[PDB]
Design a protein around this ligand. Structure first.
Ligand code: NAG
Ligand code: NAG
Lengths: 104, 140, 104, 133
């Protein structure tokens, strides 16, 4: 119901990504489930457009769509994979795991 | 088939929170030849190596080393352009099985010369196939 | 159907924001309507986490929620308003209008 | 109540897309009235409630006054001579950028100044500041 850091463990064997991703077998990427309702809290890192869009949808839901609960900050993780057939280890594969959720 | 060295680097930097890799991208390259071991005079055994290296030019090579499998000798490595001596050193005893050799300066020149399948020769005065490790940090 | 730059003109008098915002009377903030379905297109500036979430929702919609169409880049606009009773002119009030949409 | 100067700068930079303000944030401050204008050489005091965030840098700041005269303005700390110049134009500007720079360190404070002319349209202060965050 609320825009929160809902847990979401992932396993690459389920999505067939074991072809290129050597390790790890999985990780806790989490997700941002919930909805964004006006007024938007400052702890959800809202935007100037998100504040206006929430007010417009409050007046007329058909005029504008709702703000959405989406990740705002994404932490990196160390992975080992094959990049074009080359065994590559990236200690900081940025954009994988979520650390902060919010509305946009 | 995952190289054991690449598997160790993953686990080490995750378990030990005091140390981090010198570079973000650590690439592993494999040898192409698998059937050569000529012997000559004075026990001078030699064997060649070949690698398909393609390092993106928008990166800077922090470190690059060659991993060789052994069982008191002078291991000297060359590069075939008639042979270009890369690095030469000494090994002690027959107890240690593996060894590393810095070839960072060689890979830096190959980055300017462009991506090419280079060939090397080692002179010692499923298998443990030698591999090449490249530590490069992206600038993008 | 696609995450696109659907038009959305705004007027501050409709939301009573004429109290502090002196000028302009309104502007074209646009909006990001549509849905994000795997595979995600490169024109939607996806993330590593957004690509994974789409694969999980494709496999099992109950495991994870779907990616969302949210603004990714927001251009500034020149406004004149009262900041705590002080006549303030901001030539670049960043975050108001959308210039690029995408999935997160 | 919108100041005419703040409305004019908005339309100017909106119509002419070749020019931009010297700073992103342009603030307008108003004087506190005391209905006094002694004549001899007319003089009159002013007071302003200035609160410039320390995380901003003051690029330029000018004082707009409504009017040959010798206008010399002071600042009440003793008296500190700010600027002196030469002068029928109705308005006139006088750079007080260095004064606001010291007031930015002092915090939100009600500063008072004095204007001496040797010889509604309320005088206001304009502050051009650029954010650093
Ligand atoms: C191996 O080298 C050749 C050129 O010598 C190149 O075309 C090929 O792409 C390389 N292998 C891989 C997997 O990139
Ligand atoms: C005037 O300055 C004082 C400084 O203490 C401040 O508290 C007050 O809010 C200011 N006036 C207005 C209208 O903001």
């Amino acid at each position: 119901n609320y825009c929160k850091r809902t847990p979401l463990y992932i396993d690459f064997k389920e999505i067939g990504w074991d072809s290129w991703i050597i390790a790890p077998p999985g990780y806790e990427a989490y997700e941002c489930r919930g909805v964004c309702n006006y007024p938007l809290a400052e702890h959800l890192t809202p935007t100037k457009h998100a504040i206006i869009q929430a007010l417009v949808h409050l007046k007329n839901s058909q005029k504008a769509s709702k703000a959405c609960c989406v990740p705002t900050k994404l932490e990196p993780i160390s992975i080992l994979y094959l990049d074009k057939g080359v065994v590559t280890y990236k200690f900081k594969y940025e954009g994988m795991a979520v650390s902060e959720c919010g509305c946009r | 088939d995952p190289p054991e060295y690449m598997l160790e680097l993953y686990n080490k930097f995750a378990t030990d929170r005091t140390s981090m890799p010198s570079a973000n991208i650590i690439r592993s390259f494999k040898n192409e030849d698998l059937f050569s071991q000529p012997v000559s005079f004075n026990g001078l055994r030699k064997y060649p190596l070949l690698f398909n290296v393609s390092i993106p030019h928008h990166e800077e090579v922090i470190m690059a080393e060659l991993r060789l499998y052994t069982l008191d000798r002078k291991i000297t490595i060359f590069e075939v352009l008639n042979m270009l001596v890369l690095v030469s050193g000494e090994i002690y005893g027959t107890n240690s099985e593996w060894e590393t050799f810095d070839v960072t300066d060689a890979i830096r020149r190959w980055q300017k010369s462009g991506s090419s399948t280079h060939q090397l020769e080692v002179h010692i005065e499923n298998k443990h196939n030698p591999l090449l490790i490249v530590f490069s940090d992206d600038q993008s």
